[PDB]
Structure 1
């Protein structure tokens, strides 16, 4: 529906090469230092003042594993994205009150992180499919908001 079968193959292929342990910590650490208004939500994770502390903090790295796994879980079936993220969207809307833009910002940083880790293999058609995936996830986690 959303993606062509050739587009789906490449997206699923690259997601195999990823190192879930380190990619999640990388993207979360970058967002907390590039856009430094998300440090407010992660005050439970300790010191986050300096970029090296943000990268070296164990808690954000562990939270990166949770973020990455949920992204992989969302990739399981695209039409279910409304129902897949309905449980998580409520947490981000009623308890933490995370603005929908931060979902779009984290996804954009994820594309940059994946491009940094891979290199030339981040073919422009490949990133186009990834952006379409990211846009849906940001919309799906925000569609709960009303």
Structure 2
């Protein structure tokens, strides 16, 4: 994989306008709603029986913040996401046995959330940069399976 300098600039610049305290819960909650089978990885998170329960669940919001904060840190290591995600790959793959295909689904949900928060600013070219970003994150997190 390879990020162009324009990919870097776009990822870094859009991410600087993202409010992680909102986006985190919105992204994980949306994943749990839209692709419900992913809820089986979060039985300890309490009520996930309805969309309103999921989007208002305080554990979902707290954990989505963690997710996006790790992504925010990863954006400072665009040219070595594999090394940067190595310990999270061991966690998700050797420990939790998360299906690699779900890392792609979360990427799709993040892209949706960015489209919602930025509207027209999320141009085709910007979406392409971020589609490359979430695909590279999925590849880096599933590395222990590969």
Question: Under a length normalisation based on structure 1, what TM-score does the superposition of the two structures give?
Answer: 0.95
Q: How far apart, in 2, do the equivalents of 1:109 and 1:11 lie?
A: 16
Q: How far apart are residue 76 of structure 1 and its match?
A: 1.0
Match of 1:88 in 2: 88
Match of 1:100 in 2: 100
Match of 1:58 in 2: 58
Q: CA RMSD in A?
A: 1.2
Greater helix fraction, Structure 1 or Structure 2: 2
Instruction: Give every structure 1 segment of 4 or more consecutive aligned residues whose post-TM-superposition deviation is greater than 4 Å.
Output: none
1:130 matched to 2:108? The reply is no
Q: Which sections of structure 1, spanning at least 5 residues, go unmatched?
A: none
Partner secondary structure for residue 21 of structure 1: helix
Q: How far apart, in 1, do the equivalents of 2:86 and 2:6 lie?
A: 28
Q: How far apart are residue 3 of structure 1 and its match?
A: 2.0
Equivalenced residues, count: 146
Q: How far apart are residue 32 of structure 1 and its match?
A: 0.4
Match of 1:15 in 2: 15
Match of 1:6 in 2: 6
1:49 matched to 2:49? The reply is yes
Q: Which sections of structure 2, spanning at least 5 residues, go unmatched?
A: none
Question: Under a length normalisation based on structure 2, what TM-score does the superposition of the two structures give?
Answer: 0.95
Q: How far apart, in 2, do the equivalents of 1:6 and 1:103 lie?
A: 24
Q: How far apart, in 2, do the equivalents of 1:82 and 1:6 lie?
A: 21
